[PDB]
């Protein structure tokens, strides 16, 4: 019943076994003769064993700038920072003389060091296909008074699967077990692809391309590291007139990267979980599933219409009705026939609607036929007769 | 004397007018028979009347995010932020129903607004060629004790020129006037170019290219909070019809730098430029005069206050102090062979004179190749120094 209200909803009926396709933002409603109707949804996808290949700096900051110069013939200057791997240093020559604090005139050595601090980075992660955990929520069409579209899932059984551990039995309280034998059909195969994770965005790119990016990086081994390799790629030393040396940053490469990542497979991201484009093709066996209460009698009393009939985006209708008679637990009689009550016409979605408690109303979803129809719920006397229109 | 110590120094000599070329980090020393030796340096170039064409945002920030949704058939939602020109808003549709707070099932309108704040921008400035003011410093070789290489210029007469007001007379206190008739020799002409100014960097780019940049901008008139084309850096994502999200497209600073590779880079400094273009001047010294050419020679002895040093161009600078009496008076100076037979080196600081006994004088001279004798003053106590 969770699928009710989502536009990207599929209605799959098995001719015992049934192949369904789950993806994010898509729900699948499965039906089978004398089997409970079930709602499946892919709630979350997670890569749990991702090996950081390389981390690139896309926005950096230079701080703790220190300079030392020497007068001509006084040797090469030196700073301790030149041995600190978090500092980038460069030696040059400046014009020195009387007017510049030297007793004699010549090229005095200069040295400028600055602390390379990354403000924004990009991480490349290698993910093994079999380590992609999926979380599917199975919500049975139990008619429960609040079961309709309830995201909380206090109604559906959550189950986690992986491309290897493809087969799982999930028990549904009151309906038995359902066997699921799933299989991943991602857009691209994770072999030679790198999951380029930046911020809240993510992409799938060629390994060699990733490694060939001209940006400062930290190897997967040194994570939380401070010895950024190739700092030169974002740092530039300028001494054009031999008067003074200046250290200048090359500016955030974030948008540049985004432009470069246009012809790449984008992945949505969320703090180590992924909303992935690909789909999951499962096979579902209902041989162990059973209609709860297949041995129950028909409700005798009359029913009241607690909530106005509503139409879903796929033409089906949902009717929430409350039992006022006596007998509960009892089977709800339901039928959609023509205006002349000659033959049953529409289909039932919420197969086998049953009452559990008189106070708790029941939600029944059915596919009415095109045009004028009659929704008959209950039995005479007080048998509810509602006329419905279907353009 | 300012040129002394700069490697990019030129020694220009003119028969009895003289054409010189000034650029940043280049000094020119001019000499002429019976005329004072002068040091010229281009100290600053400034574009003074630049009309901001457009200002682009290269790094932005979205804050104060606000959302409103409505149930199906309940109309279009609305926020006041939609009327605030600092906010970027967008309407979409989400799946609504019983499980989502609506009495019936359908597409409910949503609207998301966020405050667009620029964190880093780029300004395009149009500069008129004739408005490029140059600041040249003319420092005479006056020998004063500290004049040597003094960047302050408290001894050098500053002069500002423009490609139009090319001809200027500059008066030098004690030496008369010098006529300068300059001309610009830039690399590119400012016609159809825009000076793309970002931070400490600057470039010269095609006008149409500049206007074709897909970034949020503010017109020259609004220099303001109503950033135009905010869409170019903001994106609204609603892929599953459940929720709308507003996401920034990330700083374009480095992207711009990459795009600006095949462009003429200019260095910048808070509205001043370190332009690569050379200024070709002509200098007339007919009104220039050696200060004190009628004074007599010093009789007393001189003292050597500072160790002789050699410049990058082989010239030497000698600081000497007068101990005798007669000041103001002319220092006798000569650089001859070891046998004192004939004068060999040249004088750079022509007509070195003493003003006050306490204040030493800086004399710059070109010694000859090899062994030489630097003779300063006259016997008795005439300084005799040896050069290699």
């Amino acid at each position, epitope marked *: 019943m969770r699928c009710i209200g989502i536009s990207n909803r599929d209605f799959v009926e098995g001719v015992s076994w049934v192949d369904i396709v789950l993806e994010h933002g898509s729900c699948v409603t499965t039906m089978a003769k004398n089997k409970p109707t079930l709602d499946f949804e892919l709630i979350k996808t997670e890569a749990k064993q991702p090996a950081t290949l390389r981390k690139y700096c896309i926005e950096a900051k230079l701080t703790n700038t220190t300079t030392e110069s020497r007068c001509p013939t006084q040797g090469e200057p030196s700073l301790n920072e030149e041995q600190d791997k978090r500092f980038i240093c460069k030696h040059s020559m400046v014009d020195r003389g009387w007017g*510049n604090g030297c007793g004699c005139f010549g090229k005095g050595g200069i040295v400028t060091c600055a602390k390379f601090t990354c403000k924004k980075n990009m991480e490349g992660k290698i993910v093994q296909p079999e380590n992609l955990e999926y979380t599917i929520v199975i919500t049975p069409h139990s008619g429960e008074e609040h079961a309709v579209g309830n995201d909380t899932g206090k109604h559906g059984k959550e189950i986690k699967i992986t491309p290897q551990s493809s087969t799982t039995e999930a028990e549904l309280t009151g309906y038995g077990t359902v066997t699921m034998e799933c299989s991943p059909r991602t857009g691209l195969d994770f072999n030679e692809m790198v999951l380029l994770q930046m911020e809240d965005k993510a992409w799938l790119v060629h390994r060699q391309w990733f490694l060939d990016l001209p940006l400062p990086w930290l190897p997967g081994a040194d994570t939380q590291g401070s010895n950024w390799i190739q700092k030169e790629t974002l740092v530039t030393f300028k001494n054009p007139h031999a008067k003074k040396q200046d250290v200048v940053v090359l500016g955030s490469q974030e948008g540049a990267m985004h432009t470069a990542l246009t012809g790449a497979t984008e992945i949505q991201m969320s703090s180590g979980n992924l909303l992935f484009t690909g789909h999951l093709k499962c096979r579902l066996r209902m041989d162990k599933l059973q209609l709860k209460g297949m041995s129950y009698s028909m409700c005798t009393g009359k029913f009241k219409i607690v909530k106005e009939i509503c139409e879903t985006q796929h033409g089906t209708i949902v009717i929430r009705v409350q039992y006022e008679g006596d007998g509960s637990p009892c089977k709800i009689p339901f039928e959609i026939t023509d205006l002349e009550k000659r033959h049953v016409l529409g289909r039932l979605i919420t197969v086998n609607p049953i009452v559990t408690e008189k106070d708790s109303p029941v939600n029944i979803e059915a596919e009415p036929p095109f045009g004028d129809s009659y929704i008959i719920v209950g039995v005479e006397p007080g048998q509810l007769k509602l006329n419905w229109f279907k353009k | 004397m300012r040129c002394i110590g700069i490697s990019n120094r030129d020694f220009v000599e003119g028969v009895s007018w003289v054409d010189i070329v000034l650029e940043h980090g280049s000094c020119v020393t001019t000499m002429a028979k019976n005329k004072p030796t002068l040091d010229f340096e281009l100290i600053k170039t400034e574009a003074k009347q630049p009309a901001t064409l457009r200002k682009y945002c290269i790094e932005a920030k979205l804050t104060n995010t606000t959302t409103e949704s409505r149930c199906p058939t309940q109309g279009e939602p609305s926020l006041n932020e939609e009327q605030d020109k600092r906010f970027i808003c967008k309407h979409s549709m989400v799946d609504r129903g019983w499980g989502n707070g609506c009495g019936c099932f359908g597409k409910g309108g949503i609207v998301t607004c966020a405050k667009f704040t620029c964190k880093k921008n780029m300004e395009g400035k149009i500069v008129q060629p004739e408005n490029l003011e140059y600041t040249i410093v003319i420092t005479p070789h006056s020998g004063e004790e500290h004049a040597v*290489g003094n960047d302050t210029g408290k001894h050098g007469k500053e002069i500002k020129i423009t490609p139009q007001s090319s001809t200027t007379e500059a008066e030098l206190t004690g030496y008369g006037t010098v006529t300068m008739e300059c001309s610009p020799r830039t690399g590119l002409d400012f016609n159809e170019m825009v000076l793309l100014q970002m931070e400490d960097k600057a470039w010269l780019v095609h006008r149409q290219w500049f206007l074709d940049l897909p970034l949020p901008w503010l017109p020259g008139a609004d220099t303001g909070s109503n950033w135009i084309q905010k869409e170019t850096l903001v994106t609204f994502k609603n892929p599953h019809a459940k929720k709308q999200d507003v996401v920034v497209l990330g700083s374009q600073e480095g992207a711009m730098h990459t795009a600006l590779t095949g462009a003429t880079e200019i260095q910048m400094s808070s509205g001043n430029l370190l332009f690569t273009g050379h200024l070709k001047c002509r200098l007339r010294m007919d009104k220039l005069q050696l200060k004190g050419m009628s004074y007599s020679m010093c009789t007393g002895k001189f003292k050597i206050v500072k160790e002789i040093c050699e410049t990058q161009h082989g010239t030497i600078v000698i600081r000497v102090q007068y101990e005798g009496d007669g000041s103001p008076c002319k220092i006798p100076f000569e650089i001859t062979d070891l046998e004192k037979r004939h004068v060999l080196g040249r004088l750079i600081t022509v007509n070195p004179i003493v003003t006050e006994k306490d204040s030493p004088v800086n004399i710059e001279a070109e010694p000859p190749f090899g062994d030489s004798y630097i003779i300063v003053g006259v016997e008795p106590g005439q300084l005799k120094l040896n050069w290699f």
Partner: antibody
Amino acid sequence: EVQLVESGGGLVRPGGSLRLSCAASGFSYSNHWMHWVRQAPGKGLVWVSRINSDGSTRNYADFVKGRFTISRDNAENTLYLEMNSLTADDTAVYYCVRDGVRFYYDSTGYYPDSFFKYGMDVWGQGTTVTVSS
Amino acid sequence: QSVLTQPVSVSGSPGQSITISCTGTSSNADTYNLVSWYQQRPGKAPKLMIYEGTKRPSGVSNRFSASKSATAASLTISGLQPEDEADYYCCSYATSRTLVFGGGTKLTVVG
């Protein structure tokens, strides 16, 4: 003559920030090194920081682990000291000081030669900073 | 590193010549070659008295002179007058980039 006038001193809460600003006039400011010195009430002088002409060289005392940033605006003839994470140890008078002698050796005031001859010859009246609660 | 220490107090009589020492730890001849001396009268701003170990700026009374050694630097005041009853501080480099002051010496002129 030549004088330096400090501003920005006052009451600040512990952990708070303050910006001191010194206005210089009457001498070629852009070519001089500038220092900040402090003095706790009734106690001795404590050197805090220095900045060269360009601002490319900015040095700080060991007690300011990174909490103060010195800066300058040559065309405005202004010196600044940005202070964060202030504690009771920092209550003091802060003096703006010129290194006039180095000017006599390096008229550019740029080059950060090791152990260069210096002299703090011009001092401001000082601004009182009181970090209290 | 380098730490400069001075005597806490020095007491002199008018007309007398007193000497205030500035000694350093982890210091060398260059520390003292660069020593400067500052006079601070009560409630007044410091005044530069000596720079480069021994040079006296113009305006500073010729009664003030200074000396330096390889282990200490000293300021000498000849002919003590009531007008010089200040705190005196020495200063030099702590490192190639950073300066340090001494703890100060209070000089009393016995009136």
